[PDB]
Amino acid sequence: CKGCLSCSKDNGCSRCQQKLFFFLRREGMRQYGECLHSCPSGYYGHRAPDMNRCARCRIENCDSCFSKDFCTKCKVGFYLHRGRCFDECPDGFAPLEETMECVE
Amino acid sequence: PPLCAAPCSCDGDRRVDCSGKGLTAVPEGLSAFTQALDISMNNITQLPEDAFKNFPFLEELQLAGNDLSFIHPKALSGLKELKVLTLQNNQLKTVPSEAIRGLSALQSLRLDANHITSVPEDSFEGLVQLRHLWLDDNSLTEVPVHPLSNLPTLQALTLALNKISSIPDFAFTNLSSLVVLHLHNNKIRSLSQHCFDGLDNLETLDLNYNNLGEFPQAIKALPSLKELGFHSNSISVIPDGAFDGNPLLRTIHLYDNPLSFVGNSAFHNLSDLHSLVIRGASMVQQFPNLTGTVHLESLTLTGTKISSIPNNLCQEQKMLRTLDLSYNNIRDLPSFNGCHALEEISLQRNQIYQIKEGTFQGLISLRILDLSRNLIHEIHSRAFATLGPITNLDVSFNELTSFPTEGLNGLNQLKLVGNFKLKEALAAKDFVNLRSLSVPYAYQCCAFWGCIHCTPSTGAFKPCEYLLGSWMIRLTVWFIFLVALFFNLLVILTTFASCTSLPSSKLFIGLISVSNLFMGIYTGILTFLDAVSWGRFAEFGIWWETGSGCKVAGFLAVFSSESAIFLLMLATVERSLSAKDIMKNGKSNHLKQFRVAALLAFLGATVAGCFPLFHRGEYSASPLCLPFPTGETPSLGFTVTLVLLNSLAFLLMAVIYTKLYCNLEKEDLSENSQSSMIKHVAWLIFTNCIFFCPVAFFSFAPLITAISISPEIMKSVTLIFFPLPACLNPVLYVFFNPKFKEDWKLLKRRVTKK
């Protein structure tokens, strides 16, 4: 109900602010929408004229993704190359460990 | 928890969470070793200079939702390790280029939802590590080409929800490392021929909710493009060769567009394409070529003037799964052998007329198939032989006269509505998996009831086994038929065998009984038809309903039933005129007039039965063949039309009787012969009125939704009260009128003499 224009107890928050992101919070068999200033891990924001909703990162093996198919950073052991998860760097690219991504 | 400066918490590992504390200034007491800071959801309106001097090692900085308006240009001095910066939900109104000048290590910059209108030309200079950028939900009208020209390492950029309308040439000529560009929900309507030149590493482009009325040619310089979306726009024309320059496309979005014409060879040579949906392509009449496109999974073409389908479709596509070609002018069906991956086919609203045996030879994964609203009138008996897990089938609104059944045991949903020429019944042994069914005639649903939603419902109005139904109901109709016929024919012989001057009073009694006999013969049709279909009415129900016999039986019933009412009231006026002439003239000279008036009622009754023949289906409302159950304006509005006069009629023929009753003196009925006549007619009007209420009162029930009547009771009262006056009328003339007694004596001498 924090920062929610219309919040309830069962449904929880039904409408956040016009610029604030609305996310459906699911807890087992109990689910209710809520307000979060930004999408959590595994989610990427989707700004829309009506209202803003958190979107699950469909991109595989990605901790936080920027958009539909671009990943900010993947999990450990899966390097970052053009925003994609790769176990090893491809041809023409060298592995990098400390900052966990692909380089030349 | 690790120790932290009040009132906010510290996660540890150089991570500090001081967000949502309502603070207006940078928190202090934090170790310089800190690497991440979140102070969002606070009231920090303005950033003082050197606000982060004691903190050299940050890489993460969060400032969302703080209503920031001004930042000191040197407030960010000394932060050379920062990589990600979030500044959404503030009132900057302009990009603080001066403050971010020294941010060499910055990689991700968030600047959306801050009412920014314009940016300086020297913005983002030196940002050598930038990869991402949030710039949506602002008042930008022009693309900041010059500031963007200084970010060769940028990868992801969004410009959604902005007032940008035009894009000049070489707007992103320096974005070599760009991967994905977002532009959805903008006022863009014009694009230059070389706006996108140089984006050799572009993969994803979004342009939804814009005003592109003409297809842009600038896209032809995007070899690495993979996904494109411009749906919900004003595009109308897709010329051929539009996708020549981007041969690695995978997914497209063009729905919700006023597209009319599509190039014939537009989509050819697109190997990696997976989906294809076209709607509203009215101007398209030719099948688009698909050479070089062998990975389409879903194909959909609606609202086109396409007439034929190329025969190579099933031999080219291999993994095609769902296919839709509705709302077109398809006439012939090519062979579908080969489309092994096919699962669903929709061909509704087309000019198909025939189905051949081999049309579905090669289908193995078909599950749902629709052919509703076509011109099909014939189907091969083995059309559905070579099919597997077929589940849903719909061929409704067509002209089949028959239906093959082999190979359809797995069917669950089946729809045959509209097939008025389909007559036969379907065996349940073939459709053991049938669950939902709709058929043109309800009697077909009799077999499948399980006593499985079968429509239309086989209500009591349309029974399956017994027409009359109840045993005790059955006897009455059999009972009424005998008594009505025998007595009616008897009374005619009494009046018409005497070669005597027939008076008006005797005459009118003759015609009603003569007309009344038609009820007897009509009821005989019912009792005979019920007897023939004893316990098996369903099989004959459809043929009898649509057959000419129901029309004749329906015409017969309405004719005489109306004929009585249009004629019994003629007795009332005759009786009143005879009564009035008793003390006025003493003789009646209107006998010829009544004879003339006698015939007109029959013709008026005749046109009553002819009217349902004009509007088809009026007589076919119920197998009882008697316009009474709720129907449709043509019939429904007709049904109320008949009853209104008769109900109206029942007011007049009463009042003059009451008027004459007040007029006549009590002693006048003591011995005059006209008392017998006036008292006899008084009873026919008595019964025909009261027995006409239940039929009339029940007819208004559909118009009164407040009361719901059971159909079985609805049918029952009509079957016992509508023809009841037929049997009852001659009884009074044969057991109460003294006049008939002497008539019976007259013919008794006549038969003995002859």
Residue numbers in the entry:
A (entry chain B): 40 to 143
B (entry chain A): 26 to 476, 520 to 822
Task: Give the article text.
Leucine-rich repeat-containing G protein-coupled receptor 4 (LGR4) plays a critical role in regulating the wingless-related integration site (Wnt) signaling pathway and is essential for organ development and carcinogenesis.
We purified the binary complex of human LGR4 and RSPO2 using gel-filtration chromatography from a mixture of individually purified LGR4 and RSPO2 (residues 20-143, Fu1-2 domains). We determined its structure using cryo-EM at an overall resolution of 4.0 Å. RSPO2-bound LGR4 structure is almost identical to the apo LGR4 structure with an overall RMSD of 0.40 Å, indicating that RSPO2 binding does not induce any conformational differences in the LGR4 structure. This is in sharp contrast to the ‘push-pull’ activation mechanism of related LGR1-3, in which hormone bound to the receptor sterically clashes with the membrane, causing an upward movement of the ECD to avoid the clash, resulting in receptor activation. Upon RSPO2 binding, LGR4 undergoes no significant conformational changes in its transmembrane and extracellular domain structures or their relative orientations.
